[PDB]
Design an enzyme around this catalytic site. Structure first.
Site, PDB file in Angstrom:
ATOM      1  N   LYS A 127       1.321   1.495 -14.604  1.00 29.44           N
ATOM      2  CA  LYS A 127       0.929   0.273 -14.846  1.00 29.44           C
ATOM      3  C   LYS A 127       1.454  -0.277 -16.382  1.00 29.44           C
ATOM      4  O   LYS A 127       0.950   0.350 -17.289  1.00 29.44           O
ATOM      5  CB  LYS A 127      -0.298  -0.175 -14.588  1.00 29.44           C
ATOM      6  CG  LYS A 127      -0.853  -1.715 -14.918  1.00 29.44           C
ATOM      7  CD  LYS A 127      -0.400  -2.693 -14.136  1.00 29.44           C
ATOM      8  CE  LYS A 127      -0.525  -2.216 -12.323  1.00 29.44           C
ATOM      9  NZ  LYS A 127      -0.225  -3.382 -11.699  1.00 29.44           N
ATOM     10  N   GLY A 185      -9.207 -18.432   3.001  1.00 31.12           N
ATOM     11  CA  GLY A 185      -8.077 -18.540   2.096  1.00 31.12           C
ATOM     12  C   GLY A 185      -6.916 -18.370   3.096  1.00 31.12           C
ATOM     13  O   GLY A 185      -6.730 -17.768   3.883  1.00 31.12           O
ATOM     14  N   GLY A 226      -3.452 -18.843   1.979  1.00 36.78           N
ATOM     15  CA  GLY A 226      -2.440 -18.906   0.888  1.00 36.78           C
ATOM     16  C   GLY A 226      -1.428 -17.878   0.996  1.00 36.78           C
ATOM     17  O   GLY A 226      -1.496 -16.811   0.595  1.00 36.78           O
ATOM     18  N   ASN A 227      -0.359 -18.039   2.091  1.00 30.24           N
ATOM     19  CA  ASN A 227       0.748 -17.280   2.214  1.00 30.24           C
ATOM     20  C   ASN A 227       0.738 -15.845   2.709  1.00 30.24           C
ATOM     21  O   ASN A 227       1.818 -15.337   3.283  1.00 30.24           O
ATOM     22  CB  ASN A 227       1.619 -17.377   0.760  1.00 30.24           C
ATOM     23  CG  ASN A 227       2.322 -18.564   0.679  1.00 30.24           C
ATOM     24  OD1 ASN A 227       2.751 -19.357   1.435  1.00 30.24           O
ATOM     25  ND2 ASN A 227       2.051 -18.974  -0.693  1.00 30.24           N
TER      26      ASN A 227
HETATM   27  N1  LIG Z   1       1.096 -10.935  -1.393  1.00 33.28           N
HETATM   28  C1  LIG Z   1       0.780  -9.746  -1.306  1.00 33.28           C
HETATM   29  O1  LIG Z   1       1.657  -9.024  -0.824  1.00 33.28           O
HETATM   30  C2  LIG Z   1      -0.385  -9.142  -1.735  1.00 33.28           C
HETATM   31  C3  LIG Z   1      -0.624  -7.793  -2.094  1.00 33.28           C
HETATM   32  C4  LIG Z   1      -1.820  -7.412  -2.333  1.00 33.28           C
HETATM   33  C5  LIG Z   1      -2.890  -8.323  -2.408  1.00 33.28           C
HETATM   34  N2  LIG Z   1      -2.875  -9.515  -2.245  1.00 33.28           N
HETATM   35  C6  LIG Z   1      -4.125 -10.483  -2.120  1.00 33.28           C
HETATM   36  O2  LIG Z   1      -3.967 -11.168  -1.470  1.00 33.28           O
HETATM   37  C7  LIG Z   1      -4.797 -12.763  -2.214  1.00 33.28           C
HETATM   38  C8  LIG Z   1      -3.989 -14.038  -1.680  1.00 33.28           C
HETATM   39  O3  LIG Z   1      -2.659 -13.777  -1.867  1.00 33.28           O
HETATM   40  P1  LIG Z   1      -1.696 -14.396  -2.732  1.00 33.28           P
HETATM   41  O4  LIG Z   1      -2.070 -14.279  -4.225  1.00 33.28           O
HETATM   42  O5  LIG Z   1      -0.189 -13.881  -2.671  1.00 33.28           O
HETATM   43  O6  LIG Z   1      -1.609 -16.131  -2.228  1.00 33.28           O
HETATM   44  P2  LIG Z   1      -2.529 -17.113  -2.548  1.00 33.28           P
HETATM   45  O7  LIG Z   1      -3.031 -17.054  -4.118  1.00 33.28           O
HETATM   46  O8  LIG Z   1      -1.889 -18.522  -2.798  1.00 33.28           O
HETATM   47  O9  LIG Z   1      -3.886 -17.392  -1.714  1.00 33.28           O
HETATM   48  C9  LIG Z   1      -4.886 -17.487  -2.244  1.00 33.28           C
HETATM   49  C10 LIG Z   1      -5.579 -18.776  -1.601  1.00 33.28           C
HETATM   50  O10 LIG Z   1      -7.179 -18.598  -1.271  1.00 33.28           O
HETATM   51  C11 LIG Z   1      -7.602 -19.944  -1.439  1.00 33.28           C
HETATM   52  N3  LIG Z   1      -8.792 -19.526  -2.233  1.00 33.28           N
HETATM   53  C12 LIG Z   1      -8.949 -19.589  -3.616  1.00 33.28           C
HETATM   54  N4  LIG Z   1     -10.455 -19.398  -3.757  1.00 33.28           N
HETATM   55  C13 LIG Z   1     -10.929 -19.346  -2.669  1.00 33.28           C
HETATM   56  C14 LIG Z   1     -12.125 -19.297  -2.372  1.00 33.28           C
HETATM   57  N5  LIG Z   1     -13.590 -19.048  -3.006  1.00 33.28           N
HETATM   58  N6  LIG Z   1     -12.643 -19.367  -0.979  1.00 33.28           N
HETATM   59  C15 LIG Z   1     -11.578 -19.277  -0.220  1.00 33.28           C
HETATM   60  N7  LIG Z   1     -10.260 -19.442  -0.545  1.00 33.28           N
HETATM   61  C16 LIG Z   1      -9.886 -19.710  -1.861  1.00 33.28           C
HETATM   62  C17 LIG Z   1      -6.535 -20.881  -2.200  1.00 33.28           C
HETATM   63  O11 LIG Z   1      -6.071 -21.399  -1.139  1.00 33.28           O
HETATM   64  C18 LIG Z   1      -5.614 -19.655  -2.481  1.00 33.28           C
HETATM   65  O12 LIG Z   1      -4.358 -20.450  -2.545  1.00 33.28           O
HETATM   66  C19 LIG Z   1      -4.641 -12.400  -3.379  1.00 33.28           C
HETATM   67  O13 LIG Z   1      -6.308 -11.935  -3.713  1.00 33.28           O
HETATM   68  C20 LIG Z   1      -3.860 -11.333  -3.670  1.00 33.28           C
HETATM   69  O14 LIG Z   1      -4.246 -10.762  -4.594  1.00 33.28           O
HETATM   70  C21 LIG Z   1      -1.501 -10.057  -2.013  1.00 33.28           C
END
Ligand SMILES: NC(=O)c1ccc[n+]([C@@H]2O[C@H](COP(=O)([O-])OP(=O)(O)OC[C@H]3O[C@@H](n4cnc5c(N)ncnc54)[C@H](O)[C@@H]3O)[C@@H](O)[C@H]2O)c1
Ligand SMILES: NC(=O)c1ccc[n+]([C@@H]2O[C@H](COP(=O)([O-])OP(=O)(O)OC[C@H]3O[C@@H](n4cnc5c(N)ncnc54)[C@H](O)[C@@H]3O)[C@@H](O)[C@H]2O)c1
Ligand SMILES: NC(=O)c1ccc[n+]([C@@H]2O[C@H](COP(=O)([O-])OP(=O)(O)OC[C@H]3O[C@@H](n4cnc5c(N)ncnc54)[C@H](O)[C@@H]3O)[C@@H](O)[C@H]2O)c1
Ligand SMILES: NC(=O)c1ccc[n+]([C@@H]2O[C@H](COP(=O)([O-])OP(=O)(O)OC[C@H]3O[C@@H](n4cnc5c(N)ncnc54)[C@H](O)[C@@H]3O)[C@@H](O)[C@H]2O)c1
Ligand SMILES: NC(=O)c1ccc[n+]([C@@H]2O[C@H](COP(=O)([O-])OP(=O)(O)OC[C@H]3O[C@@H](n4cnc5c(N)ncnc54)[C@H](O)[C@@H]3O)[C@@H](O)[C@H]2O)c1
EC number: 1.4.1.9
Lengths: 364, 364, 364, 364, 364
Positions: E80, E177, E179-180
């Protein structure tokens, strides 16, 4: 000539006619067999009356070099180059630069050396164009002590064949010609303690021989009738002809001369009498071993250790001749062909990184 | 035999049965462990009554070479080849060319050397097919001064174990066999100024020993009962048997002979008495160090500096034997296995360009 | 077993016993002949009662793959791996990583593929350790349309043998088993316009066959007695046994099943009657051609153009069978051995930069 | 420590904390500048009370080696390794094999040598893992005649600065310590014909000095007050302190000792008096030149020809000190930084095949 | 900090402090373990109050990436990078060119990817200096369908654990959530035919969810108390805290959020209740698999076939948790450490031409 008939009767791989007009080169490279390794051969420059003379000469010498390199224990094939010109007046740089590029364009498939007609000053012009040339190197620069040492070992083997003992203290050796190859031979034969009977067309060399080792000055025409044990011809070919076979009083013929039998019927008659004839191209193969050990990076001790094995080569020729009830000049060819076929069949398993004689390897 | 049971009980990597019909080769290559480096092993040619005899023999020698190469400090594994034939009458070129291609087809995973049955004239035929052969080079060409020098250093270490002082002026060393390895040993022992008691099955070698260094000619059957300090067996194996253990009056056994203990119960009894037995394959490992230093490009000073460390090897064997309250022949195996496991775990970080013992590197 | 006797009677190059303790691998790799190229063979995982069962099985399959790869026109040898385990419960990653390193340590001398017992999910773990694995690539990922297309071409050739005409409009083909390889075969046979008589141990596949191409649902025990022309067994081996030879009313046997004759006396009796038996491993060799064309970089059109030549392979088998007055199952072996010996002798001239099947070359 | 503040104030490239648990290695490699070439530095093994002690020590020595390698004329950077352990009892093979792999994983970016705490027996274990180690080779195996020869040349230059004449026949040189580096210095100084006043904490070395070259045995505490010309300290650092500055009666200080000034205010006071102080790391840089000429393949004549230039190095230091009206210990740093910046700007044109100090090139 | 104590308690290989003054770079690269392969890790740019904050953060994320890459089935280690700066105002080209040269100077030992703080516009400046960067290529340019697909497969496995059936027609899934990453998850869950209960801090995304798949808009604070089956947190970390454990009415927790348990005592309490908690870094490891399949040359079908195995990863975690009578968050660490130790011991046989993840190989 119907040249593919002559090629098909003896399995020639290639004949190859090089030419260059602005330099005046007309060369004939003949590659007979490249089963064991690359085709090592001499580059001979000589004037022939036509193309067919040179072509027949190149084909005979290609077959002869294949059986020599096979029966010597080398991982090398047989070929031969003939350059059609006059070495007194028709040499320059430009034909050897053209010729060195024609050797480099075979990609290591044919290695050249000096021979009758070229010197080690024309294999320096070839070396400016190719790596596949031998007898040149500043480490190297002289096959005559090597050829004499090999004739000495082959005479040891023929003496143990005809008698049983190889210690030559108490033997009589008649030697014709004292020209640089029988000279070191006479060094070896008196440093063992054997009696010498030398002759030569000159007398100053005979005077040198008598002053060095106490040899016996005998006239050149009656060297054949001298009552001796081991007759060692070192002058020319065609010595054993019909005119001289009853003249011999010796039973061991072992000399460094090329093309000793005039016709194979003479070899049949020698085998019917009982003269132990070790063959011509098995004994005198020390110089080819010397110039082929340069391909490793030249080292004197390794090359002399390899020249020492001519004792074993002659011993296998006599073992095959007594097994197969044939003469010895036929036994030499059959030894060589058995080595060729056995190494065709015993090196057949696949490797994607095999070693040949031109391979890059560890320095060690 | 249930051959995978025998392999699984000791973690053999491979057993490998080579064969070639036109040359008559039947070979068994056994690779035990290749953790530290490539598997160096001897190529032994011998006649066995069946396949199972040769197989059991190859497996025991593979394990023995792994512990030898590990406890010597070399970056080499353990393996062993057995060729099933008769070295008096069943050798030619074709089987060693076939065998050299079977070694080249392992891709450097197994390195061969001469052993009981082959010479340095059969590792020249193998060298025409592979680089993974050692003991051949014109720089190299004789492990016996090396093995004697290592026995000398190990005897220094065992003398500092049993007494505290390593200066051997004022000691008595009884040596059986004066055959080329105890001979240079006796050179070293009198040039330090120690008293020698030699014996041999011959007398001319004993006469040479008495004429050189003033040793004491004693009969061969009662070399065991001689009141001495350091008994150095250099003749055969099975010398320490039940028939000879009470015959000893010495407390330091340090000789170059292979397989000294007949059974491990004898080693238990030696440790119960108090005779300081430095183990067999830690002392006499100088010749393997000598033939493994050729893999760098052979240099005499580097190899002798590496053979000097047998003092430290014996000292660590005695330190582990006093730490672990076990005999010393068990301490040798545990030293070697600790070195194997520690170099498995300490060389674990990733490199995409690591060096092993066969690597290309700067000339320097 | 006297394992070198069994190796020497058939000229096996190597048998090779791999083992790994922390992963539980016990493997037997057998390389029969590597004259034409590297040894391609399947990796079969199965539970055998002892080692000798697995050893005899690996040796038979190595010889069978040599004659298959030779008589198919491929530049590949014959070998076979047997992993001794249980594929339902004794697989993990660690044994295939250990095994892929044991293949990489042969240096391209043996190429592996999937077979009875392994999937294309275990040749992805092997691919993480080696390049010498085939049937894996994302370009590739299905030999069954290929094997069916080759059976179709071989049936064309056998129909021109038995009749003279190869246009099969107006023929009757009885097919047992509709399991993925005779299914595309039945596609080809009705798209030419030939009448089909199918059977299977199931009925849903028979319902699929009748719904697709209007075949005739016949019971499985009396598929042998159906009056037809070309009988195409595609289910198991040992179908042609003594219990079923007089049951046949067909004169052309050409199917994709392995090991069709139970004993060679059955093949003698078929040749004495007059049933045109094209041999088993010449017809169904399309899948091996498909997985061996991946070694170029996989292209569908080149591989189908190579599978098209099974017509010519069957035609040469029948030409040798009529020349030599032997049966056809003997003619297949003699075709393959003539191809092996002829390519040993015709590829003998030296090159220092030759191409094999694993060579790096121009993209083009 | 706020370690990036200390790095940013002096432009350190990297600090790098290696660790290995099964071998017990804790190492700190510090690379200051790699503008001119790779970072050559010593590997020092010592016991520090914490990590911060070792870290501050590694950072100071990295800066010191950058200015030494720059002002010596070498194409090498500055770095330094500190191994945290005890060299009397905390060494084995496993930590140096782990450490050699951590050097090989920098890819030639850092070259190591022996220093205070390691020997040339630990750079043989490192050499089994990497090429980026110097001071090891069998051609090489002794920087002390080199360092003495360089001190001799620097004293020539300082004598031509303070007087105008460099021929030292008729000069008085006081030398403290006769430990292997001032000893060859005293050889050079009497073979020129200069008068010597030696001292040492021992007397046997003083007896050797008086027996060899007729020096004057003076007590060690009052070597400072001896009326002489050229005072050459060769024992320790912190010799020029406030307690000893008025004790001097000499005007040329040129010795091989490291860290001669205790504080830079002492250098200010020396420049205010008029004692010609040639700086410490410009004179004694002969040993680093000797161990950096091994990177070409070691040759004694080339390395001595490069050590001869310390005359010109001292002459440029005095030219900059008279141009810039600063002391000489500041002039050394500014000479080195001008060389670093000028070679940054003058080697800026693009080449895709440039040479550095580790490059492969023609043997010649 | 006594930084080697913290390194020695967890076996960190390296910590490495890069710095560049003219560009303003202060970076901390931490490489934990490189046993399985190179250390893949994200490059995170963030502002920390001191160095010790960034150092502790880099060390925790290095250990976390080692267990993630191990338990995912990848041949990659864990490391990291932390860049200490402000990504809103402290970026330019010069720091990423300096940083790309500091990655190229590790020689492939550390591979970087985008993470929290950098984009795929800063890994184009790094790509101008190095090959050891992933997530950049024009073939590649989006881990969110991959991560959602892997969460879907892990939820299949946890549903077969808690119930026995994996067909989720007739299940209730609450998702916080959208979010994508939970969005494509909700695509997969309704295309199987499962009932969805979504929430989010926004409402427009909730409106999109209800318009697409007929989900149930529930307030965000009481998503925890919803009577459901499979609760899938996808928003933040620290969701499972002491304040929310009795709020749950679900027995399967399987979401893509990082750092789900606040303290391991919470995981102890979940295992004491009976909620089937599949661990956090085994389910959401699909994106790391996607960006690590680029190292082969990116292919979508191979990468999705590898992401499909998260079913088997979760099934082995539950098998170890039921074998060892420990919780599941401990079972994930022990699965990963068993894979690390087993691949240390099963890949120990010597090859001089092994393949790693960065190796050059055939195009195929
Ligand atoms: N994209 C990947 O491949 C990947 C890999 C490992 C971990 N993650 C985890 O997935 C999570 C979200 O994915 P992202 O970051 O790629 O997209 P993202 O950040 O857009 O999705 C998160 C969404 O959750 C909602 N949010 C924020 N606070 C909230 C709360 N208290 N309660 C409910 N919803 C809330 C919001 O809409 C936010 O946009 C993150 O914790 C990220 O670390 C993603
Ligand atoms: N040097 C080698 O390595 C080598 C290799 C193969 C063959 N040979 C053969 O060895 C023979 C001589 O060796 P060389 O050519 O290197 O040196 P050379 O030509 O100087 O020796 C030949 C000498 O023999 C004498 N001579 C000529 N005619 C004679 C005759 N009727 N009777 C007696 N002596 C006569 C002359 O003194 C002549 O100088 C040649 O036939 C040569 O082909 C030599
Ligand atoms: N040369 C090495 O580097 C090396 C390495 C490992 C082991 N060894 C061992 O050293 C021993 C001898 O060394 P070598 O084989 O190289 O030379 P060697 O065989 O010539 O020495 C053995 C000599 O011991 C004498 N001998 C035979 N039987 C005897 C008996 N009952 N009692 C006393 N002496 C007897 C004979 O003189 C014999 O020549 C052998 O056991 C050999 O295995 C040598
Ligand atoms: N796929 C290839 O490229 C290839 C290559 C060489 C040989 N073969 C041979 O083709 C045969 C079948 O091909 P497959 O294994 O790929 O698919 P498959 O196993 O699915 O086809 C066999 C089917 O035959 C039927 N069957 C079983 N016993 C039967 C019986 N007594 N009578 C009639 N039908 C029976 C079943 O429907 C069975 O599914 C096999 O013998 C196989 O060894 C295939
Ligand atoms: N050998 C090189 O190439 C090299 C390079 C750079 C610096 N140096 C410096 O040269 C100095 C000595 O060289 P060395 O270490 O290689 O050999 P060394 O340590 O044997 O020489 C030092 C000798 O000085 C004497 N000594 C100790 N304390 C003394 C004191 N108060 N007063 C007078 N003499 C005292 C002792 O005899 C001591 O052996 C050291 O400071 C070393 O750092 C040497």
């Amino acid at each position: 000539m119907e040249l593919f008939q002559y090629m098909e009767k003896y399995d020639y791989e290639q004949v190859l006619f090089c030419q260059d007009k602005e330099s005046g080169l007309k060369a004939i490279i003949v590659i007979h067999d490249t089963t064991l390794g690359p085709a090592l051969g001499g580059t001979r420059m000589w004037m022939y009356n036509s193309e067919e003379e040179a072509l027949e000469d190149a084909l005979r010498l290609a077959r002869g070099m294949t059986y020599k390199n096979a029966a010597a224990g080398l991982n090398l094939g047989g070929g031969k180059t003939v350059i059609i010109g006059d070495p007194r007046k028709d040499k320059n740089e430009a034909m050897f630069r053209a010729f060195g590029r024609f050797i480099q364009g075979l990609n290591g498939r044919y290695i050249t050396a000096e021979d009758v007609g070229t010197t080690v000053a024309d294999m320096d012009i070839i070396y400016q164009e190719t790596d596949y040339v031998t007898g040149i190197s500043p480490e190297f620069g002289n096959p005559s002590p090597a050829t004499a040492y090999g004739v000495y070992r082959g005479m040891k083997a023929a003496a143990k064949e005809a008698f049983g003992s190889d210690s030559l203290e108490g033997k009589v050796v008649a030697v014709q010609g004292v020209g640089n190859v029988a000279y070191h031979l006479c060094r070896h034969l008196h440093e063992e303690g054997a009696k010498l009977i030398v002759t030569d067309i000159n007398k100053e060399a005979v005077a040198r021989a008598v002053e060095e080792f106490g040899a016996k000055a005998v006239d050149p025409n009656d060297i054949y009738g001298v009552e001796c044990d081991i007759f060692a011809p070192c002058a020319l070919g065609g010595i054993i002809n019909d005119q001289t076979i009853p003249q011999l009083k010796a039973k061991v013929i072992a000399g460094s001369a090329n093309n000793q039998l005039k016709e194979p019927r003479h070899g049949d008659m020698i085998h019917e009498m009982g003269i132990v004839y070790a063959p011509d191209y098995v004994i005198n193969a020390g110089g080819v071993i010397n110039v082929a050990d340069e391909l490793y990076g030249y080292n004197r001790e390794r090359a002399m250790k390899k020249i020492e094995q001519i004792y074993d080569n002659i011993e296998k020729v006599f073992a095959i001749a007594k097994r197969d009830n044939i003469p010895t000049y036929v036994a030499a060819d059959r030894m060589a062909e058995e080595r060729i076929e056995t190494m065709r069949k015993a090196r057949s398993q696949f490797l994607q990184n095999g070693h040949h004689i031109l391979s890059r390897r560890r320095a060690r």
